[PDB]
Design a protein around this ligand. Sequence first.
Ligand code: ATP
Lengths: 618, 52, 69
Amino acid sequence: NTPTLDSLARDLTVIAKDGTLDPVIGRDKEITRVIEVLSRRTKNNPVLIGEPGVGKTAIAEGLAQAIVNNEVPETLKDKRVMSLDMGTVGEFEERLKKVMEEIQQAGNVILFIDILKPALARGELQCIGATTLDEYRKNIEKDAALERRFQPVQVDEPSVVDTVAILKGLRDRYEAHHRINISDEAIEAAVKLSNRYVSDRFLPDKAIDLIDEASSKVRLKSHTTPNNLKEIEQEIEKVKNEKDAAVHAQEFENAANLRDKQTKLEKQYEEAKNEWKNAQNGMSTSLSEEDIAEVIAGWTGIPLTKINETESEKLLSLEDTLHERVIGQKDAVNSISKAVRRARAGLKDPKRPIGSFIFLGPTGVGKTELARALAESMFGDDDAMIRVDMSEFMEKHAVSRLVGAPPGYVQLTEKVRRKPYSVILFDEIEKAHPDVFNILLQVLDDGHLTDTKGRTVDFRNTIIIMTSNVGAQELQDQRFAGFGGSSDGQDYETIRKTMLKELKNSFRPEFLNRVDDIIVFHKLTKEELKEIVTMMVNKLTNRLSEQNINIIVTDKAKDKIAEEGYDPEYGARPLIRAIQKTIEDNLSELILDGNQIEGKKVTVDHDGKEFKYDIAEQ
Amino acid sequence: VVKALNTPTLDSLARDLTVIAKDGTLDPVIGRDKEITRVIEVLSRRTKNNPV
Amino acid sequence: MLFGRLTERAQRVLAHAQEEAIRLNHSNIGTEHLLLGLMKEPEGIAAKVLESFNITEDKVIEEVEKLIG
Ligand SMILES: Nc1ncnc2c1ncn2[C@@H]1O[C@H](COP(=O)(O)OP(=O)(O)OP(=O)(O)O)[C@@H](O)[C@H]1O
C-alpha cells in the first residue's frame, strides 16, 4: 500500500472515494488524453503545459476520481494517483529513492509533480508533470534524457459552451445552500458578462466569480423585515426589561400584568412571523439578469447604462456619438461606421482585427479625440486605450520590448493581454524599425502573437489604428490650389485615392492590403471653431455642476476668441490656451471672492474691446 | 439601595465581542454601514463568502 | 443603549426636568434639574431611599433654588 508514499505526499484517490468535493466538469478530453498517453510504450509521462490557474489541478482530480467511477480503462484500472507538492523540497534525496522503489514494486502508483533522470530514462516512474511552459522549456528541454521521455500535453481553458455546461452541472450545489432559484437565462448572461470584461485569470475562475453578490442582493432584500416584526420585537424587549426591573424592585403587583402583556406580545409576534413566513415561502427566489449586470458594473466601474444593452443599437448610435463628440468631417465617421459593423456581424474574418484604419492629415485636427470617441462608443471605457509611441522604436534592439523581455536580457503584449477589448493607437508609424512593420503585418494577418515565454496573446478583438503624419504637405496644397475655394468640394474618393497612391510609395504594397479604409481628415475653418468654442464652454459648465453655476457665452465672444489662435498647423491647441487665459482667469477670481457668483448666472459678452461679465440670478 | 433592593472551548481560547457590545461599552460604529452591508452580503453565499 | 433601557419612570424624570427648565428660564438642562425631576417621582426605588433619609420635596426644592440663580 506504499506507506512511505502515503505519508510523504497527499493521496487523491482517498478524497475522491468519498466524493465530498464538486466533480470535475468540462474536462472530459483531458482525462482521455492523459489515459491515452499513459498507455503509450514511449513517452508515457504527460505534462500539463499551460499557465497556472487554468485548472491543472482539476485534471489530476478528475484522473483520480475516474478510478472510483470505474471509467478508466484496463490499463489504468484500480491504480491510485499520488501527487507530491513542491513544498516538501542530502536527506531530501533519501526519501525519493524509497518512494520510487515502492512505486516500482507496487506497479499501481502514478506519480504527479508540479536525481530523477535515471528513473525516467528506464520508464520506471509514470510521473505526470504540471509545470508551466516557461519552466518546461527551461529545465526539461535542456536535458536530452527527459526530452524523449515526457510527452507535452496542451491544457488550457475550455470553450464558452463548455463553461455553460460546467455552470449548469453544478447548479444544484449552489441552489441547495442558500435556497436560491437560479433561472436558466441568468447563466448565459452571467457567462457572457464574465468573459466580456473579466479575462485575466482565465477559466473557470473568471466565470464562476460572478455568483457571489447577484443572488445575495435579492436574497437579502427579500429576507428583511418590512416594518412588521421589528416593532413587535422592540415592544417585547422593552416589556421584558420592564418585567425584569419590576422583579428586581420587589413589586410583584405589576408582575402579573407585565407577564400577561409579555405573553400576549409573544403570541402576536408568533402569529405575525407565521403569516409573514407563509407569504415568503409562497413565492420562489427567482433570479433576473439585472443583478449580474449590476454586479459587473461595480466590478469594473462601467456605468450600468452601457452594460444594459442588447448589442444592437450600439452600431446605430456610434455615428450619433461620433458626430456629437467630434464636430465636422462626417466622411470619416461614415467610412469607419460601415467597416466595423461588417466585422462585428461576422462578414470579416474573426481572427483578423475588427478595425485597421489609418489616420492621415495635418496635426491638430483631433485624431486622438476621434479615437477616444470611438473607444467610448464601442467599448464604453475611455481609459481602455493602449498607446505605443514609435519614436523610441528606431533601433534593432527595440523590437524585443513590446513583445516582452527575452530570456537573458531582464510591453504592448502584456498590456493588451489584460484588456483584449481595447483600442490600440500608434504614432509616427512612418518612422519605425522595419521589424515593427513585419510584426504589425503579422498581427493584421494572423490575429495573434506569442511572447518569448511561450504564452500566446490575443489580437482578434483588438482594433489597430496607426497615425501617420506623411502626406500632410499634399492636402494643404490642394486647399490653396484654386482661388475662391478649396478641395472640400471635391469628392472624398478622389482625395482618398490620391493619398493612397502617395502612401504606398513610402510603405510596403502588401502592408496596405489589410487596411479596411483609409481615413483622411479635412481642415479647420472659421465656422468649425465656433462650435468647438461652444463645446468647450459646455464642458466647462458641466465641470461646474457641483457649484451650481450656469455660464452662457455669446456668439460674439466665440467669434472673437476663435481668431485669437487661428492656425491650421497648430490646430486646436491655441484654442485651449485662449479659453483658459480669457474667461477662466476672471472666473477663478470671482469664485475666490467669498463665493461671489455661487448659485448665480454668469454671462460672457464681447462688446468689441473687452469681455464684460454679467452676474444675475440663475 | 442594596439592602432595599454553549461551546466553552472557544470562549477561553479567544475573546467574545458580542458579549461586551451587549453591555453597551464599545464606541458606536457610525458611518461604516456601507462596509457592514458589503460584508454581510459577501458572507451570505455558497461560494466566495470570506470577505477580506 | 441610551433609550433602550430607560423605564417609564426614567422618561418621566426627564420630562419633569425638561418642563422645569422652561419655567426657570434656563436654556441648559443641567444636573440641578434631574434632581428635581427625580424628587417628583414617589413610585421608584429611589423614592424610598430619600424617604428613609429625612429628605422631603419642599426642602430640596428651596435648597437647590438657593444654590442656583
Ligand atoms: N471638432 C472638434 N470639436 C472639439 N474639439 C476638437 C475638434 N477637433 C479637434 N478638437 C480638439 O483638438 C485637440 C487636438 O489634440 P490631439 O492630441 O487630439 O491632436 P491630434 O490632431 O490627434 O495630434 P497629435 O497626434 O499630434 O496629438 C483634441 O484634444 C480635441 O479636443
